[PDB]
């Protein structure tokens, strides 16, 4: 990195204690249906700021070889992908790929119901502002399994998709949109993804009365093939780093309200 701009790019791509918000790459295979393209467009619209989009056709089958996905993630610094495809067996498929250190951490197939899919344009409502994080609700008994399964992995990936940029504070006017995912344990269960806009009304109390109005998209999924993490890779990925602003607690040493260091004797 001789040039300072390339040095800046490398420093952005370097590992950090407090990581950057994850970037999602939206891409499609050689054959991909219009419904699958519409679903990818709706997800990109919900995640415009931290997503990149490919526009060509890629001869990639993710559950056979993922070297091309690893190369694309390394080149684009995109730690998530949404991959679209279509077969006779699998007519409308969205493959969520999450990676760790430019290698595939885990993968999950979603099968999209074409008869119940509604886009964001099919609801005549006020839409979400660009870059604004929606709140998330995960409902139903499918996500509380004692053993890790497809629904637990789907919940983790959807949280990682819709989490946005973390912040210690939020404006009360930024609480207007909610994403609700509903799924029950059991023939195959259906994961339902809905987005609503939130209005508040007087109730005679301090707390407002919440009423919801549909924003879109309307998606129904059936969970398909699954690629679980290597346990050692998962342990490395689920390690958490301690920021310098988190003080390592010393025995009998404290800081009082005036900032003095105080020792305790017994």
């Amino acid at each position: 990195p001789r040039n300072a701009r390339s040095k800046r790019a490398l420093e952005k791509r370097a590992p950090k204690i407090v990581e950057n918000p994850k970037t999602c790459l939206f891409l499609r295979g050689t054959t991909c249906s219009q419904i699958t393209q519409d679903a990818m467009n709706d997800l990109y619209a919900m995640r415009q700021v931290h997503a990149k989009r490919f526009h060509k056709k890629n001869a990639i089958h993710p559950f056979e070889d993922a070297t091309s996905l690893c190369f694309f993630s390394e080149k684009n610094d995109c730690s998530l992908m949404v991959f679209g495809s279509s077969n006779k067996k699998r007519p409308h498929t969205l493959t969520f790929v999450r990676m760790f250190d430019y290698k595939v951490l885990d993968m999950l197939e979603f099968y999209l119901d074409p008869d119940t899919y509604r886009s964001i344009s099919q609801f005549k409502t006020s839409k979400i502002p660009i870059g604004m994080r929606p709140m998330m609700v995960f409902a139903g008994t499918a996500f509380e399994s004692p053993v890790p399964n497809a629904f637990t992995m789907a919940k983790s990936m959807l949280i990682d998709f819709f989490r946005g940029e973390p912040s210690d504070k939020i404006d009360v006017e930024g609480l207007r949109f909610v994403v609700v995912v509903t799924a029950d344990e059991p023939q195959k269960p259906i994961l339902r993804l809905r987005v609503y806009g939130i209005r508040t009304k007087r109730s005679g109390t301090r707390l407002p009365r919440v009423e919801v109005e549909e924003h879109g998209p309307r998606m129904d999924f059936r969970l398909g093939r699954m690629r679980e993490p290597d346990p050692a890779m998962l342990k490395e990925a689920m390690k958490k780093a301690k920021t310098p602003q988190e003080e390592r607690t010393k025995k009998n040493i404290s800081m009082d309200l005036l900032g003095d260091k105080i020792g305790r004797i017994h």
Partner: peptide, 13 residues
């Protein structure tokens, strides 16, 4: 102008 801000309080612009 639109996708970028100093603060991340999720406020409209």
């Amino acid at each position: 102008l639109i996708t970028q801000a100093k603060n991340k309080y999720n406020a409209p612009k």
